[PDB]
């Protein structure tokens, strides 16, 4: 028990590693896909108005509206087409690291160091955005929050815990435990049944929402994982950490499939997002750039250099028209 | 421009004016981040200033101080310290009374002050250090000074030398010319503890003004 259980766990881990190695290689695997070479994305819009560091942004369903959270205590809902401030939501807490847009477009979510996921109702009467459902129950800070639907939300926190909440009652209905370190990122599957979760314990765990248990784990990194994102297929995901590398894992094979690293890159990755087709993988770094890797060729296809501080958040439209990055220079820009 | 689009532009301009006014009002505030240990290093200075994060707002001498209790965040400090890169100062407290108390109180992570002094964001952020429980130090020091705290003392007894020794030891970890460390002695009985941080904040803002005037 004191040592027999530990020996059994070590033997099980060794057997899992051996099975993973035996379930690898097979029919390096690149087929001369004729990569995109160099893509020259340019800044089409600039969005001024924030007076502190932009920590998170999220796109809307219509790919025309977006929400941005800054350290000055404000959410701003921008109309990206005409550079219009649709809404300016003040917040009780000025320390927010995440913000979300409900897919229905009726709500936004906001969270940070106050350990509360606040929902805000946009499409309501009285012409003002009001607070509704300050969900509470986490002990650590919230690093991410994603809407399942108008009634269900998922929140990843710094107390080594993810949570699934229903917003109608205000009570958490599922708790996801198993991470040893603080959880930093969260990406929902397209079918809204599963989600990946990266932690500072250099582990990413794939969870089933309905069952409530970790279906599998991946431990191929060496530092704190900061960002994660699903492939549009829902069968793979990619992530980045503070060891200046990105890794694409696959859900079914349960291995690390590809690694994006460079010798001259010695800065951590803050934000990771795919394009619509999944061929492009855009990652924001601490070197003030935003690199665009080829997700199937593992080379730096492009560089987005328009920010004078740390690129913190990075989002891509649902229709693939635009890429919006927010950095610590109080400005977020749109590339096309 | 349609009538609806012109009214939308007018609404956006009103929002921009409100944002500028709020930023103008908030640029006068002073952001101080409060750090230390649970042994009377946080609550006494919070009380003498008058869930996840606690705000302590006050206005001293037409200066809006707001103090940032993050003591409830029982987690790793590395993943949320970048939120405090823009603060004026770090009010860090070190317990004298725990020179012999095991927890040792002086050896928090062995680097409770080293990590704060050099966490790649506080490279020019001043630290106001507070020496905790001076009265109990004066009524307690007659019990094994040269102990597990610092076995290199070779010095005099009583409060006025041991306190100076520990203060110099904690200042010796600075290794920063631009950054300054302001130390003070507290007893949780006095009322002159807002001016210790206020004069410090005046010094940092005068230094920032000198740097902005192109003279240093």
């Amino acid at each position, epitope marked *: 028990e004191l040592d027999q259980l530990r020996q059994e766990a070590e033997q099980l881990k060794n057997q899992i590693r051996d099975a993973r190695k035996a379930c690898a290689d097979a029919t390096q695997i690149t087929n001369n896909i004729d990569p995109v070479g160099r893509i020259q994305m340019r800044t089409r819009r600039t969005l001024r108005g924030h007076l502190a560091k932009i920590y998170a942004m999220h796109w809307g369903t219509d790919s025309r*509206l977006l929400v941005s959270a800054s350290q000055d205590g404000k959410l701003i809902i921008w*109309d990206s087409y005409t550079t219009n401030k649709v809404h300016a939501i003040p917040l009780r807490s000025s320390w927010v690291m995440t913000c979300a847009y409900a897919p229905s477009g009726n709500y936004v979510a906001c969270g940070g160091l106050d350990n509360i996921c606040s929902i805000y109702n946009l*499409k309501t*009467r009285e*012409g*003002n955005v009001r607070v509704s459902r300050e969900l509470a129950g986490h002990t650590g800070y919230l690093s991410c929050c994603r809407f399942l639907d108008d009634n269900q939300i998922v929140t990843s926190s710094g107390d080594t815990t993810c949570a699934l909440w229903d917003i109608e009652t205000g009570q958490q209905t599922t708790t996801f435990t198993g991470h040893t370190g603080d959880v930093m990122s969260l990406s929902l599957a397209p079918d809204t049944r599963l989600f990946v979760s990266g932690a500072c314990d250099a582990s990413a765990k794939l969870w089933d929402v309905r069952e409530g248990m970790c279906r599998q784990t991946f431990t191929g990194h060496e530092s704190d994982i900061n960002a994660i994102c699903f492939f549009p297929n829902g069968n793979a995901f990619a992530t980045g950490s503070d060891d200046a590398t990105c890794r694409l894992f696959d859900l079914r094979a349960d291995q690390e499939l590809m690694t994006y690293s460079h010798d001259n890159i010695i800065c951590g990755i803050t934000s990771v997002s795919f394009s619509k087709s999944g061929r492009l993988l855009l990652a924001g770094y601490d070197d003030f750039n935003c690199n665009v890797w080829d997700a199937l060729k593992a080379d730096r296809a492009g560089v987005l250099a328009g920010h004078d501080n740390r690129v913190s958040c990075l989002g891509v439209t649902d229709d693939g028209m635009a890429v919006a990055t927010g950095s610590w220079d109080s400005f977020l820009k749109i590339w096309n | 421009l349609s009538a609806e*689009e012109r009214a*939308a532009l007018e609404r956006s301009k009103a929002i921009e004016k409100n944002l500028k006014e709020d930023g103008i009002s908030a640029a006068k505030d002073v952001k101080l981040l409060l750090l230390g240990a649970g042994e009377s290093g946080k609550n006494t200075i919070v009380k003498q200033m008058k869930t996840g994060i606690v705000e302590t707002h006050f206005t001293f001498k037409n200066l809006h101080f707001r103090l940032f209790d993050v003591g409830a965040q029982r987690s790793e400090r590395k993943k949320w310290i970048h939120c405090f890169e823009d603060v004026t100062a770090i009010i860090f407290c070190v317990a004298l009374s725990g020179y012999d108390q095991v927890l040792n109180r002086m050896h928090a992570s062995l680097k409770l002050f080293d990590s704060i002094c050099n966490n790649k964001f506080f490279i020019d952020t001043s630290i106001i250090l507070f020496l905790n429980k001076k009265d109990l130090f004066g009524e307690k020091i007659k019990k094994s000074p040269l102990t597990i705290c610092f076995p290199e003392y070779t010095g005099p007894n009583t409060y006025e030398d041991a306190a100076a020794y520990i203060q110099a030891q904690f200042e010796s970890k600075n290794r920063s010319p631009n950054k300054e460390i302001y130390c003070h002695m507290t007893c949780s009985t006095d009322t002159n503890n807002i001016q210790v941080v206020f004069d410090a904040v005046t010094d940092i803002i005068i230094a920032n003004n000198l740097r902005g005037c192109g003279l240093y």
Partner: single-chain antibody, 230 residues
Framework: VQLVESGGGLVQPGGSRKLSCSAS????????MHWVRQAPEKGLEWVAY????????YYADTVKGRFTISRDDPKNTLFLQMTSLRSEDTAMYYCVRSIYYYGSSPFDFWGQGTTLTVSSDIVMTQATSSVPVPGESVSISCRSSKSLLHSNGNTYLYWFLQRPGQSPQLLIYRMSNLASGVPDRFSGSGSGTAFTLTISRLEAEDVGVYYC?????????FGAGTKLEL
């Protein structure tokens, strides 16, 4: 939401009357306000428009220069002062809530109006005056003198309904986009200078007069009014 009208009554010609509107239940300071008149036996007609912040003010050409519109946001009260009252000023007046951003619903709420009795525009006309018509589907047409499709893909025709003894209500904003508290049986369609309103499975409490209003460019010109009766 409650917009309450006050003032009116019987006046002598050449006098002045100060109509007032008290707004409650909503953020009055972020809403544009409209004054819209209606003749005792004819269709609706727009009078005045004030925007949020008291910045942009538009008046009707038929009453421009003698009518003043104003507001007080601390008191939450809209005001319309009218001097040199004429015989055509005998009408009953409406205060209209409107809000303008992406996806907004202007002209959504209409107040309970007040009566006053004195002892490069665009033509907006409906070719049908009355249709006798439950359980069926009706289709009602509206025509304009200019194309209402602007270059951003937005058409600016709004469909309103006026019940016998009720303030007007918004059914559709911006060419087949429904509003809050409206059954899904109503629908819209059409193109430039030719719009259709479709009611499928017409239940009761749809008797009344329908109007089509344009918001492409000021002044605001209403239609004639398609009357549906059992």
């Amino acid at each position: 939401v409650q917009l309450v009208e006050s003032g009116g009554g019987l006046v002598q010609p050449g006098g002045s009357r100060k109509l007032s509107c008290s707004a409650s239940g909503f953020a009055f300071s972020s809403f544009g306000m409209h004054w819209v008149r209606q003749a005792p036996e004819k269709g609706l007609e727009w009078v005045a428009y004030i925007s949020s912040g008291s910045g942009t003010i538009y008046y009707a050409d038929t009453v421009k220069g003698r009518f003043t519109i104003s507001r007080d946001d601390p008191k939450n009260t809209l005001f319309l002062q009218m001097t040199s009252l004429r015989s055509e000023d005998t009408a009953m007046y409406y205060c209209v809530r409107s809000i303008y951003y992406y996806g907004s619903s202007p002209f959504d709420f209409w107040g309970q109006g007040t009566t006053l009795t004195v002892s490069s525009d665009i033509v907006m006309t409906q070719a049908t005056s009355s249709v006798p018509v439950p359980g069926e589907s009706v289709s009602i047409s509206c025509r304009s003198s200019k194309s209402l499709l602007h270059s951003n893909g937005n058409t600016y025709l709004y469909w309103f309904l006026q019940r016998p003894g009720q303030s007007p209500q918004l059914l559709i904003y911006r060419m087949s986009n429904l509003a809050s508290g409206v059954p899904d049986r109503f629908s819209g369609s059409g193109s430039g200078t030719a719009f259709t309103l479709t009611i499928s499975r017409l239940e009761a409490e749809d008797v009344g007069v329908y109007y089509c209003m344009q918001h492409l460019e000021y002044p605001l010109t209403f239609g004639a009014g398609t009357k549906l009766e059992l």
